Amino acid sequence: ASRILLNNGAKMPILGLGTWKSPPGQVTEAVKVAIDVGYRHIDCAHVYQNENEVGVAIQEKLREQVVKREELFIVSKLWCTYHEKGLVKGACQKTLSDLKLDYLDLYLIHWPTGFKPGKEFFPLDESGNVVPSDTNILDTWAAMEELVDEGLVKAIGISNFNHLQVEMILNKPGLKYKPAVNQIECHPYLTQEKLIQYCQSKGIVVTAYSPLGSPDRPWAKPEDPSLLEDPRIKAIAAKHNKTTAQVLIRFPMQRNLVVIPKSVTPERIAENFKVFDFELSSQDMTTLLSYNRNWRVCALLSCTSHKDYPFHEEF
Ligand SMILES: NC(=O)c1ccc[n+]([C@@H]2O[C@H](COP(=O)([O-])OP(=O)(O)OC[C@H]3O[C@@H](n4cnc5c(N)ncnc54)[C@H](OP(=O)(O)O)[C@@H]3O)[C@@H](O)[C@H]2O)c1
Numbered sequence: 001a002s003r004i005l006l007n008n009g010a011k012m013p014i015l016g017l018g019t020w021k022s023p024p025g026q027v028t029e030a031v032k033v034a035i036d037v038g039y040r041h042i043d044c045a046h047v048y049q050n051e052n053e054v055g056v057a058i059q060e061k062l063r064e065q066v067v068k069r070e071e072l073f074i075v076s077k078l079w080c081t082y083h084e085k086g087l088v089k090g091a092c093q094k095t096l097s098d099l100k101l102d103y104l105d106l107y108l109i110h111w112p113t114g115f116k117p118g119k120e121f122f123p124l125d126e127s128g129n130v131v132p133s134d135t136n137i138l139d140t141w142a143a144m145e146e147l148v149d150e151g152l153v154k155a156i157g158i159s160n161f162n163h164l165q166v167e168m169i170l171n172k173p174g175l176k177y178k179p180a181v182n183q184i185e186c187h188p189y190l191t192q193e194k195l196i197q198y199c200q201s202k203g204i205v206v207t208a209y210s211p212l213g214s215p216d217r218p219w220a221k222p223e224d225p226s227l228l229e230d231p232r233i234k235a236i237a238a239k240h241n242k243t244t245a246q247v248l249i250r251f252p253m254q255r256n257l258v259v260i261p262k263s264v265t266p267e268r269i270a271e272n273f274k275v276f277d278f279e280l281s282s283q284d285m286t287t288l289l290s291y292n293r294n295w296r297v298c299a300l301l302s303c304t305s306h307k308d309y310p311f312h313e314e315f
């Protein structure tokens with residue numbers, strides 16, 4: 001099936017286009033090609049610095065009546081320097097304005113950590129540590145609930161929250177809306193069995209990011225493991241007559257996850273979508289799970305002392 005049911009009663013396409021690192025001069029065309037070839041979900045964020053250009057693509061395909069708004073599922077994320085209650089509506093509204101939308105289908109708390117507000121996305125002290133804000137998870141969650149009650153977003157969720165942080169929201173005094181999604185890093189080197197079972201058991205849908213191991217991440221090092229070059233995964237692709245990327249995309253799909261591979265390459269945008277026509281066996285799935293090594297693309301050193309850092313934590 002192409003969509004999964006959310007606890008807000010709306011349906012979310014299980015394949016989306018990622019847009020982190022998509023250059024602003026290429027992501028308009030990338031999103032247009034995606035929509036043309038079947039993508040109906042786009043993963044966005046203010047911190048990606050390209051929502052304007054994403055929005056150009058969305059608006060042109062709406063204008064051309066390639067798709068209707070109702071059929072698109074657009075996600076963005078509240079950045080860490082906007083966790084204060086008084087900054088949240090504005091941050092959302094700037095995102096909406098850039099994306100050329102009147103509402104978002106899902107808005108996420110991007111990271112559990114609030115940073116000092118200002119023009120800087122990563123405010124640092126003189127020694128390179130991130131500067132926190134004294135905001136807490138639960139006050140930010142209340143501000144996100146207000147966005148639903150203002151019609152600006154259809155669903156709210158979290159990202160990069162560990163089990164206990166999810167649990168803190170689920171147990172929030174006066175909780176009005178449960179998180180719909182937890183978007184977390186997930187791939188054969190970071191399989192997340194624990195956190196995913198917890199979230200799903202609570203009816204929270206999990207979106208897997210960096211499903212290909214983010215080969216274009218700017219801090220990649222030659223000795224880092226490489227999913228797309230792992231001979232073991234290549235072998236499973238060859239057995240199915242598919243590419244390695246297609247295996248790495250289909251893998252989270254069979255775990256009842258949403259997956260959001262990023263590309264600005266039209267050939268790969270189309271290839272990445274052609275994953276609904278084959279199945280990995282249960283053994284392939286367990287074999288892929290066996291490659292776990294708790295390797296993270298996204299865990300920035302400058303943030304590891306924030307009080308709310310999520311990954312000290314067994315899960
Ligand atoms: N919530 C969060 O904190 C968070 C964190 C990280 C990422 N995300 C979201 O997750 C999305 C995906 O994660 P990601 O961007 O880190 O990386 P990814 O999707 O794992 O990998 C993207 C990289 O893979 C290449 N690629 C794509 N399709 C390919 C294919 N078929 N064959 C070979 N290479 C291929 C891309 O190259 P080209 O683009 O040159 O084709 C790009 O270098 C992001 O863009 C963002 O939307 C969210």
Ligand SMILES: O=C(O)Cc1nn(Cc2nc3cc(C(F)(F)F)ccc3s2)c(=O)c2ccccc12
Nearest residue numbers: 020047111112113298299300303304306309310
């Ligand atoms: O954010 C993305 O979508 C991609 C993303 N990831 N990272 C690695 C990060 N690691 C973090 C760790 C925490 C922590 F919560 F753990 F403290 C908080 C915030 C971050 S950003 C980045 O540094 C980054 C920089 C610009 C744009 C996007 C990103």
